[PDB]
C-alpha cells in the first residue's frame, strides 16, 4: 500500500543514538575559528546553573507590534565564580587530525585539582605533583624547553583551567578541568599570555559582557528507562488493546525481515549532551556588588537570591550570568558557555536591553514578597516578636 495519509516522522534522526553520555560535563565539539589580529580572548567559560526567575522589560524592538511596551519573560541564572588557569596545551596539525604534544603545569596547584586526580582522597598520600614541582629547580630548564616547543610548533593553543567549587554553596569539593582555546593572533602571543596567568584567576566580565549572544552546552536531566509514548511522541492505542496501549502497533513488514533502525523503540530518556544556541545575556552582576537585583527603576537594595534561596541550591554570592530562556541541564550542574561561533546577523542580536524589575520572590511555594522586610511590614507583628 501507500500509507493512505502522510504524516511527519516522530523523533529526530539527527540525535542518534539516544544514550547516556560519558560524563556530567559535556565536552565542547567546536570553537570559533581564529581572528588573528585581535587581542587574546578566552573563547568560553564554565559555571553552575541555579534555578530560574522572571524579568519584565521595556521592549526596544523597532518594527514589532510590541515596540516600546513591557514584556515579561523567564531567564536562567548561572552561578559563575572566577576560574583559575593551571595549564597550557599545544596541538600540531597532522594529516590524521590534531595531535596534542605538550602539557605544561603551573608550579603549585590547589587542593581541588589534586582531588580531581584521585577517587579516594582520604587514603592517598597526596603525591600528585610532588616530583613535578621539583623540576622547577635552579632555572627550570625543562619548562623553558617545553614552552619553546609550543612556540615553534603547535598551530593552536588551549588553556587548562579549573573552577572554584569551594566558593559555590554546592557541596562537592572537587573542581572540573576544562580546555579553552585562545583566539588572539600570533601563537607566541597566545602562549606568553597564558604563561603569565599561571596560578592566576580570570573573572567573568573579562570573557563576556551584556547584550551578547552565547550558547550553553550541558548534560540534560536523566529520567531512566522510558517507554516509547513519552520518548518519541507516538500516539496511544485507543483503549483495552490486548497487550498494552502505550506502544507502537506495527513495527515492520515481511520484507526486509529485520527491524529497521528508525521505528521508535523503547529505552533511555534524558542525560544526553545537547547544544542550544543564540541565548542572550541580560545581566552580568558581581558578587561584591550589593543590590544586584536593583535595577535603574526599582531602587530597592536586594540581591537576586530569592527568599530562602534557590530551591535545591544555596546563594548567588558570587558573579552570575543572567541569560534568557532555558539552558539545557538542571540545577546544581555544570554548564559551558561558548561564544556565538559566527557573527550573528539578525536585529535581535544587536538590541540593548534595560531590565525594569527583577523578581526575587521565593521559589519554594507561592512567592508573594520580594524581601523579608516586605513580609514583616505586611504581616504586621507576631506573637513571637513580642
Amino acid at each position: 500500500s501507500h500509507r493512505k495519509y502522510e504524516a511527519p516522522r516522530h523523533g529526530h534522526l539527527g540525535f542518534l543514538p539516544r544514550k547516556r553520555a560519558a560524563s556530567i560535563r559535556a565536552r565542547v565539539k567546536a570553537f570559533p575559528k581564529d581572528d588573528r589580529s585581535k587581542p587574546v580572548a578566552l573563547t568560553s567559560f564554565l559555571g553552575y546553573k541555579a534555578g530560574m526567575t522572571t524579568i519584565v522589560r521595556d521592549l526596544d524592538r523597532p518594527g514589532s507590534k510590541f515596540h516600546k511596551r513591557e514584556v515579561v519573560e523567564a531567564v536562567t541564572v548561572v552561578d559563575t565564580p572566577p576560574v583559575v588557569v593551571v595549564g597550557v596545551v599545544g596541538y600540531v596539525e597532522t594529516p590524521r587530525g590534531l595531535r596534542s604534544l605538550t602539557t605544561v603545569w603551573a608550579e603549585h596547584l590547589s587542593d581541588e585539582v589534586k582531588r580531581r586526580f584521585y577517587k579516594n582522597w582520604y587514603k592517598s598520600k597526596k603525591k600528585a605533583f610532588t616530583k613535578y614541582s621539583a623540576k622547577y629547580a635552579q632555572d627550570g630548564a625543562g619548562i623553558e624547553r617545553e614552552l619553546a616547543r609550543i612556540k615553534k610548533y603547535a598551530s593552536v593553543v588551549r588553556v587548562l583551567v579549573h573552577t572554584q567549587i569551594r566558593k559555590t554553596p554546592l557541596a562537592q569539593k572537587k573542581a572540573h578541568l576544562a580546555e579553552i582555546q585562545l583566539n588572539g593572533g600570533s601563537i607566541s602571543e597566545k602562549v606568553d599570555w597564558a604563561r603569565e596567568h599561571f596560578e592566576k584567576t580570570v573573572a567573568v566580565d573579562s570573557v563576556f559582557e551584556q547584550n551578547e549572544m552565547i550558547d550553553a552546552i550541558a548534560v540534560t536531566k536523566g529520567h531512566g528507562f522510558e517507554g516509547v509514548t513519552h520518548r518519541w511522541g507516538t500516539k496511544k492505542l485507543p483503549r483495552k488493546t490486548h497487550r498494552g496501549l502505550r506502544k507502537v502497533a506495527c513495527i515492520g513488514a515481511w520484507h526486509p525481515a529485520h527491524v529497521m533502525w528508525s521505528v521508535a523503540r523503547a529505552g533511555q530518556r534524558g542525560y544526553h549532551s545537547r547544544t542550544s544556541i543564540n541565548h542572550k545575556i541580560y545581566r552580568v552582576g558581581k558578587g561584591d556588588d550589593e543590590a544586584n537585583g536593583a535595577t535603574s527603576f526599582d531602587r530597592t537594595k536586594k540581591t537576586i537570591t530569592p527568599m530562602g534561596g534557590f530551591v535545591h541550591y544555596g546563594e548567588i554570592k558570587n558573579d552570575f550570568i543572567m541569560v534568557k530562556g532555558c539552558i539545557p541541564g538542571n540545577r546544581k550542574r555544570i554548564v559551558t558557555l561558548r561564544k556565538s561561533l559566527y557573527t550573528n546577523t539578525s536585529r535581535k542580536a544587536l538590541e540593548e536591553v534595560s531590565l525594569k524589575w527583577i523578581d526575587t520572590a521565593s521559589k519554594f511555594g507561592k512567592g508573594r514578597f520580594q524581601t523579608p522586610a516586605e513580609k514583616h511590614a505586611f504581616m504586621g507583628t507576631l506573637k513571637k516578636d513580642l
Binding site: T54, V56, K356, A361, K366, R368, A377, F378, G380
Partner: protein, 100 residues
C-alpha cells in the same frame, strides 16, 4: 507596573502572578494565587475567612483608620514630572513606612 492587590487576599500581586477574571460588567478581578482564586469560584465570603486582611480590618484586629494610611490613594492628574518632587517622594515613602 501597577503592584495591585489580591481581590480576596489583599496581598501584593507582582507581575506574572495569579489569574485575572473579567466579569461581563467589565471590572477586573486580579488574584493573589490559586488558593484565593478557587475560594472565589466556590462563592465563599472573605468577611468570614479568618486569614484574609478584609477580615482583620473588620473584626477589630490591625488598625483601619490612620493618618498614614491615607497617603497612598491614587492620582488621576499626571503632574508633569519635576525631579525635585520625585527626589522627596523617595524621602517620603521611606519615612511613611517607618511610621506605619
Amino acid at each position: 507596573m501597577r503592584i495591585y492587590q489580591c481581590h480576596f487576599c489583599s496581598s501584593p500581586c507582582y507581575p506574572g502572578h495569579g489569574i485575572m477574571f473579567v466579569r461581563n460588567d467589565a471590572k477586573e478581578f486580579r488574584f493573589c494565587r490559586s488558593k484565593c482564586h478557587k475560594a472565589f469560584k466556590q462563592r465563599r465570603n472573605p468577611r468570614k475567612l479568618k486569614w484574609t486582611k478584609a477580615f482583620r480590618k473588620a473584626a477589630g484586629k490591625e488598625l483601619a483608620v490612620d493618618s498614614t494610611l491615607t497617603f497612598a490613594q491614587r492620582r488621576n492628574v499626571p503632574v508633569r514630572y519635576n525631579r525635585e518632587l520625585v527626589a522627596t517622594t523617595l524621602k517620603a515613602m521611606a519615612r511613611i513606612e517607618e511610621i506605619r
